[PDB]
Amino acid sequence: SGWIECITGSMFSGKSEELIRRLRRGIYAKQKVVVFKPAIVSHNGNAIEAINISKASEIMTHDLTNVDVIGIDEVQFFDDEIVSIVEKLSADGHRVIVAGLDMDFRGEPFEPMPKLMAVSEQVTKLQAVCAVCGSSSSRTQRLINGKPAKIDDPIILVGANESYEPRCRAHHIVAPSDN
Amino acid sequence: SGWIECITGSMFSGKSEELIRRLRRGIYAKQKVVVFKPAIVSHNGNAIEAINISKASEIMTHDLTNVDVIGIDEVQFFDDEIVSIVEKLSADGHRVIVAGLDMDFRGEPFEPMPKLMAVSEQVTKLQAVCAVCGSSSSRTQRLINGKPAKIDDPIILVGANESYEPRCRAHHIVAPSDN
Amino acid sequence: SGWIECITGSMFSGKSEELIRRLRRGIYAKQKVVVFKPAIVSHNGNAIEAINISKASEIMTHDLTNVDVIGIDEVQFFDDEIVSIVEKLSADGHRVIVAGLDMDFRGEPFEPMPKLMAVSEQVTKLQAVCAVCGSSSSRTQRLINGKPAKIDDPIILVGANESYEPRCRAHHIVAPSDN
Amino acid sequence: SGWIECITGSMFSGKSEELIRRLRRGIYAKQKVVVFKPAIVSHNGNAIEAINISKASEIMTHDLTNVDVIGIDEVQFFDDEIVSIVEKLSADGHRVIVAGLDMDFRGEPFEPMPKLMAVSEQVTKLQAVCAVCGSSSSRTQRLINGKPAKIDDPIILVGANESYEPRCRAHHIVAPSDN
Ligand SMILES: [Cl-]
Ligand SMILES: [Cl-]
Ligand SMILES: [Cl-]
Ligand SMILES: [Cl-]
Ligand SMILES: [Cl-]
Ligand SMILES: [Cl-]
Ligand SMILES: [Cl-]
Ligand SMILES: [Cl-]
Ligand SMILES: [Zn+2]
Ligand SMILES: [Zn+2]
Ligand SMILES: [Zn+2]
Ligand SMILES: [Zn+2]
Numbered sequence: 001s002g003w004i005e006c007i008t009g010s011m012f013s014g015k016s017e018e019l020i021r022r023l024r025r026g027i028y029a030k031q032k033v034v035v036f037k038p039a040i041v042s043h044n045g046n047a048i049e050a051i052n053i054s055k056a057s058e059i060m061t062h063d064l065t066n067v068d069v070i071g072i073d074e075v076q077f078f079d080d081e082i083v084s085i086v087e088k089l090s091a092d093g094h095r096v097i098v099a100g101l102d103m104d105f106r107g108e109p110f111e112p113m114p115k116l117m118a119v120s121e122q123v124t125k126l127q128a129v130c131a132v133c134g135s136s137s138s139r140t141q142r143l144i145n146g147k148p149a150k151i152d153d154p155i156i157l158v159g160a161n162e163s164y165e166p167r168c169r170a171h172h173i174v175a176p177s178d179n
Numbered sequence: 180s181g182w183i184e185c186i187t188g189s190m191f192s193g194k195s196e197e198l199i200r201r202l203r204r205g206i207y208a209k210q211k212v213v214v215f216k217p218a219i220v221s222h223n224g225n226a227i228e229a230i231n232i233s234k235a236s237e238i239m240t241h242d243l244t245n246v247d248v249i250g251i252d253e254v255q256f257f258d259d260e261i262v263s264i265v266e267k268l269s270a271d272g273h274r275v276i277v278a279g280l281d282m283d284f285r286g287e288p289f290e291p292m293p294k295l296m297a298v299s300e301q302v303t304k305l306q307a308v309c310a311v312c313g314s315s316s317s318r319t320q321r322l323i324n325g326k327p328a329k330i331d332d333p334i335i336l337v338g339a340n341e342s343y344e345p346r347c348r349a350h351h352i353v354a355p356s357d358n
Numbered sequence: 359s360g361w362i363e364c365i366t367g368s369m370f371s372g373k374s375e376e377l378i379r380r381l382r383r384g385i386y387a388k389q390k391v392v393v394f395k396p397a398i399v400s401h402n403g404n405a406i407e408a409i410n411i412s413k414a415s416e417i418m419t420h421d422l423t424n425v426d427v428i429g430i431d432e433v434q435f436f437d438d439e440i441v442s443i444v445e446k447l448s449a450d451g452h453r454v455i456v457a458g459l460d461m462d463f464r465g466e467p468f469e470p471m472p473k474l475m476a477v478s479e480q481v482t483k484l485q486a487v488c489a490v491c492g493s494s495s496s497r498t499q500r501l502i503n504g505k506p507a508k509i510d511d512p513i514i515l516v517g518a519n520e521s522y523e524p525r526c527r528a529h530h531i532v533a534p535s536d537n
Numbered sequence: 538s539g540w541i542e543c544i545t546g547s548m549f550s551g552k553s554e555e556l557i558r559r560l561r562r563g564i565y566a567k568q569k570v571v572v573f574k575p576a577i578v579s580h581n582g583n584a585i586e587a588i589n590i591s592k593a594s595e596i597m598t599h600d601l602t603n604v605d606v607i608g609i610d611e612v613q614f615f616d617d618e619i620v621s622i623v624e625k626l627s628a629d630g631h632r633v634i635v636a637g638l639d640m641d642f643r644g645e646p647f648e649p650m651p652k653l654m655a656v657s658e659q660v661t662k663l664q665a666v667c668a669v670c671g672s673s674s675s676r677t678q679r680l681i682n683g684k685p686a687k688i689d690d691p692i693i694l695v696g697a698n699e700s701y702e703p704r705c706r707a708h709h710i711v712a713p714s715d716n
Contacts, residue, residue, distance in 0.1 A: 001707060003675075008655075012207040014200040021193040021200065028191040028345060029308035029316075068313070087644075090706065102655045107624075114651030118545075118639045121675045121706070123654065123662045129208035134247070137208075138540075138658045166207060169627065169658070170538060180528060182496075187476075266465075269527065281476045286445075293472030297366075297460045300496045300527070302475065302483045317361075317479045348448065348479070349359060370565040372558040379551040379558065386549040386703060387666035387674075426671070487566035492605070495566075524565060 002090040006116050007099040009126035011140040012166045015099040018126060019071050022097055023048050026069040034064070035071035038078075056082040059089075068095060075100035076110045083115045105142035105164070106151055106174050128166035137166035141173070148173040181269040185295050186278040188305035190319040191345045194278040197305060198250050201276055202227050205248040213243070214250035217257075235261040238268075247274060254279035255289045262294045284321035284343070285330055285353050307345035316345035320352070327352040360448040364474050365457040367484035369498040370524045373457040376484060377429050380455055381406050384427040392422070393429035396436075414440040417447075426453060433458035434468045441473045463500035463522070464509055464532050486524035495524035499531070506531040539627040543653050544636040546663035548677040549703045552636040555663060556608050559634055560585050563606040571601070572608035575615075593619040596626075605632060612637035613647045620652045642679035642701070643688055643711050665703035674703035678710070685710040 005022070007015050020041060026033040027043045036059060039052040048071075051062065056078040064070065070089055075082060075098050082098075090096050101110040102117075102125065117123050130137040142149035143163045151174045184201070186194050199220060205212040206222045215238060218231040227250075230241065235257040243249065249268055254261060254277050261277075269275050280289040281296075281304065296302050309316040321328035322342045330353045363380070365373050378399060384391040385401045394417060397410040406429075409420065414436040422428065428447055433440060433456050440456075448454050459468040460475075460483065475481050488495040500507035501521045509532045542559070544552050557578060563570040564580045573596060576589040585608075588599065593615040601607065607626055612619060612635050619635075627633050638647040639654075639662065654660050667674040679686035680700045688711045 003706065012204065014204060017196070017200045017203065021196045024196065025191065025193060025307045025345075029310050029313060031308065031313065107656065109652045109655035114655045115646045117654040117660065118646035118651045119644065120662075121664070121673070123660050125657075125660045127658070128204045129210065131208050134208060134210065136658070166204075169540065182527065286477065288473045288476035293476045294467045296475040296481065297467035297472045298465065299483075300485070300494070302481050304478075304481045306479070315479070348361065370562065372562060375554070375558045375561065379554045382554065383549065383551060383665045383703075387668050387671060389666065389671065486562045487568065489566050492566060492568065524562075 001093040003095060003122070004086055004090045004116070004120040005095070005097045005122040005124070006113070006120040007097065007124050007126065008102040008113050008117065010103070010128055010137060010166045011101070011164050013126035013128045013137075015126060016073055018124070019073055019097055019099040020048075023069060023071050026095075031068035032066050033069040033071070034062075034067050035073060037073045040077075056085055059085055064089070064094065070094050070096045072096070072098045073100070075112060075116065076104075078112065080112045080115060082112055083119065086116065087119060101140070103139060105140050105149055107139055107172065130168040130171055131165035132167060132171040135168050137168050139167050139169060139172035141165050141167040141171070148175045150175040150177060152177045180272040182274060182301070183265055183269045183295070183299040184274070184276045184301040184303070185292070185299040186276065186303050186305065187281040187292050187296065189282070189307055189316060189345045190280070190343050192305035192307045192316075194305060195252055197303070198252055198276055198278040199227075202248060202250050205274075210247035211245050212248040212250070213241075213246050214252060216252045219256075235264055238264055243268070243271075243273065249273050249275045251275070251277045252279070254291060254295065255283075257291065259291045259294060261291055262298065265295065266298060280319070282318060284319050284328055286318055286351065309347040309350055310344035311346060311350040314347050316347050318346050318348060318351035320344050320346040320350070327354045329354040329356060331356045359451040361453060361480070362444055362448045362474070362478040363453070363455045363480040363482070364471070364478040365455065365482050365484065366460040366471050366475065368461070368486055368495060368524045369459070369522050371484035371486045371495075373484060374431055376482070377431055377455055377457040378406075381427060381429050384453075389426035390424050391427040391429070392420075392425050393431060395431045398435075414443055417443055422447070422450075422452065428452050428454045430454070430456045431458070433470060433474065434462075436470065438470045438473060440470055441477065444474065445477060459498070461497060463498050463507055465497055465530065488526040488529055489523035490525060490529040493526050495526050497525050497527060497530035499523050499525040499529070506533045508533040508535060510535045538630040540632060540659070541623055541627045541653070541657040542632070542634045542659040542661070543650070543657040544634065544661050544663065545639040545650050545654065547640070547665055547674060547703045548638070548701050550663035550665045550674075552663060553610055555661070556610055556634055556636040557585075560606060560608050563632075568605035569603050570606040570608070571599075571604050572610060574610045577614075593622055596622055601626070601631065607631050607633045609633070609635045610637070612649060612653065613641075615649065617649045617652060619649055620656065623653065624656060638677070640676060642677050642686055644676055644709065667705040667708055668702035669704060669708040672705050674705050676704050676706060676709035678702050678704040678708070685712045687712040687714060689714045
């Protein structure tokens with residue numbers, strides 16, 4: 001009765017809008033729907049309940065016994081703990097829809113999406129349009145000073161000129177570490 | 180260089196939201212994007228130009244020489260004429276995205292989506308959630324007086340109690356003609 | 359309980375192999391499966407029954423009361439009659455899988471695939487690889503004397519040097535009529 | 538120029554047949570194609586070169602400079618080492634198609650498919666048909682003595698009555714460990 005759907009892809013691939021589109025179908029069928037998003041839409045009075053959380057554990061603190069469809073956006077902000085949470089919810093008969101990043105800016109697998117992709121019934125990898133060539137993009141390009149971020153530049157970075165854009169694998173560049 | 184993408188499915192399957200999601204990817208790649216819709220969204224100053232039209236012929240009256248991506252929503256409101264228009268635009272190097280109904284309320288193929296599906300590079304049939312059983316829906320149920328519309332009830336209907344909801348083929352009912 | 363799945367695309371896109379792959383899943387689940395193909399695979403003793411036919415009408419002459427899954431390959435060799443046949447079979451609780459051409463060599467919609475795409479629950483447009491550039495192909499290129507067939511060359515053609523290959527829309531060429 | 542396509546799903550979902558179908562499209566476009574499979578199809582004289590291997594490292598020992606398309610079947614028989622091998626081949630301009638199991642019989646993510654799904658441009662999760670209910674399956678059911686394998690039963694098992702069949706999550710059962 002319950003299953004998991006996984007939506008992934010780079011930044012700017014429309015993951016969040018796709019998650020919302022599928023939750024909206026829940027509303028037209030008069031189902032109860034909620035979405036969880038990291039802390040740090042209605043039709044005929046029935047509405048998507050949105051819920052900000054700091055930790056994946058907060059999900060089970062909510063009463064979900066009457067909820068048909070559970071969304072979870074930006075899953076890369078959580079741990080592999082969210083994997084067992086999502087399996088349990090799907091075994092308790094919920095439709096569960098998770099969205100988040102497949103890779104980080106370096107092109108490295110972004111926990112916990114690998115495992116979610118492996119255990120989910122459905123997987124949809126969305127692609128954006130490369131800011132360079134206009135072909136299908138697959139990667140998130142991080143720029144620091146109009147230049148390709150380095151493999152070892154940290155994610156917390158104070159006062160830096162920082163931008164993100166989608167790129168194809170060919171146009172994606174991770175600059176080498178310094179020494 | 181140009182191609183066609185077709186988005187179809189019943190009412191309430193999210194066709195319009197999916198068309199917008201794909202056009203938004205155009206904006207993040209700094210492409211120029213427009214959408215046409217029947218008469219009767221920005222990021223960094225670059226915006227989807229929306230354009231209401233009465234007739235498919237109006238499309239060619241617009242200057243489209245710098246437009247990367249052309250959307251066309253609710254194509255069932257137009258004729259098979261839109262087929263050659265969309266082939267020409269795709270041959271002139273545009274990415275073209277059409278959305279509309281696959282079938283009418285009777286379950287009959289809704290012109291001009293059949294031909295567009297046949298000539299398009301990509302086809303995506305979206306499914307909603309059946310208002311009866313909660314399975315994947317495929318059809319638009321028309322109700323008149325809380326009852327299934329008849330195969331021959333007209334679409335223009337004055338003063339009637341009229342509703343639409345998505346249903347699976349099993350729960351979709353077209354009532355017989357009277358005599 | 360019954361539905362339709364449509365598999366389409368150009369020649370050489372693997373439609374026939376995809377139809378067989380999906381019918382084989384029927385066998386591993388111990389379902390009874392048949393495939394119809396135009397006239398003019400087992401596992402643990404349970405086998406796909408293959409059936410050659412001249413006319414779509416022959417389908418209803420077969421006893422199908424115990425058949426879970428009905429395949430129909432090369433549907434372009436049949437008429438729009440096959441549309442109501444496939445709707446009836448799906449309404450009688452069968453899973454029905456149709457494969458055939460979306461367009462002919464001219465790029466024109468190939469009856470009866472448009473209507474089938476419109477009324478089917480699922481649609482899968484397969485793409486081959488362009489014999490010229492190696493990108494995703496969408497069209498069937500007909501060659502006569504190492505040259506692009508003409509829009510009006512007939513399909514019955516005696517003694518001619520005739521070849522077919524998949525191409526992208528850009529590399530697909532229909533030569534003009536003579537006068 | 539190069540990319541990765543990932544084909545996954547349970548046993549009996551047709552992963553191997555889908556991998557072959559996509560490699561065959563390479564042949565019709567006159568591309569050179571090879572497939573690697575664990576040790577322990579032609580058209581107009583141009584043929585898929587099949588190659589049995591014990592170790593993922595053997596792949597780089599082969600001369601691949603003229604190969605357009607590289608297949609790799611049953612990737613669960615290899616290590617995460619195959620991840621960097623597949624990224625390198627895709628960065629050297631090859632189309633790479635990997636197939637293998639998403640989960641093991643226990644429902645646990647099957648290395649190295651998680652990471653491959655995360656770094657691949659395309660992901661296709663195929664589904665079989667549940668041997669119990671006939672709905673879409675997602676899991677591989679292991680049976681020992683007509684009974685559900687236990688979470689801790691090993692995979693090497695001498696003289697046991699052992700069968701596998703695809704099941705939906707609901708009908709999939711992992712029996713508890715003994716003590
Ligand atoms: Cl990132
Ligand atoms: Cl999607
Ligand atoms: Cl309608
Ligand atoms: Cl989509
Ligand atoms: Cl043809
Ligand atoms: Cl497919
Ligand atoms: Cl296994
Ligand atoms: Cl596929
Ligand atoms: Zn690019
Ligand atoms: Zn229903
Ligand atoms: Zn081409
Ligand atoms: Zn089942």
